[PDB]
Every structure is written in structure tokens, then in C-alpha cells.
């Protein structure tokens, strides 16, 4: 009960939205025989809607004055109250993959720039080495940290093209 938001389990507007969705989904059920493939698809859609409405509730989710679930973004407020699962862990979940992509791209860039006429490697990819780096990028933050520490991550400006202002 933070930011004036009621929990999804104890929200009247959430249940109103749920029963409105159930009503509009059951409206289309009356135009098909129960032993039909469109009827089976509509029943599967209704089951998925009910499962989504059940799982969104009692999962540390809040909604306020609209029946639509809200997300808590400030860490700490997502820690003492059970709201870390909204954005706290998935932030690191995205960042792990983003650093993975950046690290394997950097590894391919260095390992291609040390090859004769290296401009063709960007249009003519090599698959074994790119896949080898693709399955070696799980420990991307450790490699990035050690490369920053030893100085091979960055390059001396002396060797960087600089605008002549």
C-alpha cells in the first residue's frame, strides 16, 4: 500500500476489468458450437486471460483507481516492500545480456582488426570464431572489469582521432 495504491488482490476496479473482459470474451462464445475449433481457441483465450488475472494478483502487484497494475521503480522501496520483481532483478537481467552483446562485439572487433585487410570481416563474417566468442561471453562483466583495470579496455587519446575545433 505505497503511493496510495491498493493491492491487485483487493482491488474492486481490477475485478471489474476482469469480469468485463470475461463478458466480452463470452459474447463471442455464443456464436460458435461448443465442439468447434474457434470455440476451442476462444476457450483457450479465456483460460489464458483467467490465468493472467490470477497470476498478476497475489504476486506483489498494486493498482490504483484504474484497475491496471502499477510498477514500483525506486529500489529500496522495492526491497522492504515485496516489489523487487517488478524492475529490480530484470534491470540486471537486461544489463547482463546487453553487456554480453557489447562484449562479444568488442571481442570480434579486436580479433578482426588484427587480421590482414580487416574491412572484409564485417561483411564476410566468420561463424566458428563468432560462435566461440558467443559461448565465451557469459563472464562478460569479469572480463570487462579486468580489461578496464589493465588499461586495454580504453585507448590513449594520443591515438584517437580528435576534432580540430
Amino acid at each position: 500500500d505505497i503511493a496510495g495504491l491498493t493491492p491487485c488482490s483487493e482491488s474492486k476496479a481490477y475485478n471489474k476489468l476482469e469480469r468485463k473482459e470475461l463478458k466480452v470474451l463470452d459474447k463471442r462464445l455464443k456464436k460458435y458450437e461448443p465442439g468447434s475449433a474457434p470455440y476451442l481457441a476462444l476457450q483457450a483465450t479465456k483460460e489464458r486471460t483467467e490465468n493472467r488475472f490470477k497470476t498478476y494478483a497475489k504476486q506483489g502487484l498494486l493498482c490504483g483507481n484504474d484497475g491496471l497494475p502499477h510498477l514500483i521503480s525506486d529500489p529500496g522501496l522495492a526491497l522492504r516492500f515485496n516489489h523487487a520483481g517488478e524492475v529490480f532483478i530484470p534491470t540486471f537481467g537486461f544489463l547482463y545480456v546487453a553487456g554480453y552483446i557489447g562484449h562479444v562485439g568488442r571481442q570480434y572487433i579486436i580479433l578482426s582488426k588484427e587480421d590482414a585487410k580487416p574491412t572484409d570481416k564485417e561483411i564476410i563474417l566468420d561463424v566458428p570464431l563468432a560462435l566461440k566468442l558467443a559461448f565465451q561471453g557469459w563472464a562478460w562483466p569479469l572480463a570487462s572489469i579486468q580489461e578496464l583495470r589493465n588499461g586495454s579496455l580504453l585507448e590513449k587519446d594520443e591515438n584517437i582521432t580528435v576534432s580540430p575545433r
Binding site: 466480452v24 572487433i109 574491412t119 561483411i123 580504453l154 584517437i160 576534432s163
Partner: protein, 107 residues
């Protein structure tokens, strides 16, 4: 013309959400996006974008992720082609979505 054709109609495209024609509203707004995104390639030139690319190349040079192929801005003819293609695609898909949603939700 405006009020009685583009406003008297297109009331079903905006109200298509939650129905079978919601994809027409999605196509309508994506077409608005693509039509609006084209004007970047149409009003602008190449020197500003080349200098911005130079700054980004410096940024990628600082931590040694410089591509072997040098990043360059699109050519002036290339930029005009991209602008006109995105403009035509956005306008055609806008009219397509509006026409189809109006003629299916009513006719």
C-alpha cells in the same frame, strides 16, 4: 472535406481497440510514425549527420570498439531516397489502415 471525411470517418479506427480491427489502428499509428520519421531524412542534410557520426566514432574509439568499416552518413541522393521511401510507406499505410478499418467496421 476535413470534418466530414477525415473526422466523420476514422472514428472506427481509433475505437478499434479490443476488437477485430485493432491491428488496423496499430497499422495506422505505425504509419503515422513512419511518415513522420521520414521528414528527418528530408529536411536535414549530410554534414550535420556526418559530424554526429564523427562524434559517435570518437566515442567508440575511446574504448576500442571502432568498426573496421568506417561509419559514414548516408549520401544526399541516398538520404533523399530514404526520406521519400519512408514518406510514401507511411502515407500509403496510413490511407490503407484508415480506408480498410472504415470500410470493414461500417460497410
Amino acid at each position: 472535406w476535413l470534418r466530414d471525411f477525415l473526422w466523420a470517418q476514422s472514428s472506427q479506427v481509433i475505437q478499434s481497440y479490443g476488437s477485430a480491427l485493432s491491428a488496423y489502428g496499430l497499422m495506422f499509428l505505425g504509419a503515422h510514425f513512419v511518415w513522420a520519421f521520414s521528414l528527418m531524412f528530408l529536411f536535414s542534410g549530410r554534414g550535420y549527420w556526418q559530424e554526429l557520426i564523427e562524434s559517435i566514432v570518437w566515442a567508440h574509439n575511446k574504448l576500442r570498439v571502432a568498426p573496421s568499416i568506417q561509419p559514414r552518413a548516408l549520401s544526399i541522393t541516398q538520404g533523399r531516397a530514404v526520406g521519400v521511401a519512408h514518406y510514401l510507406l507511411g502515407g500509403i499505410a496510413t490511407t490503407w489502415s484508415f480506408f480498410l478499418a472504415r470500410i470493414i467496421a461500417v460497410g
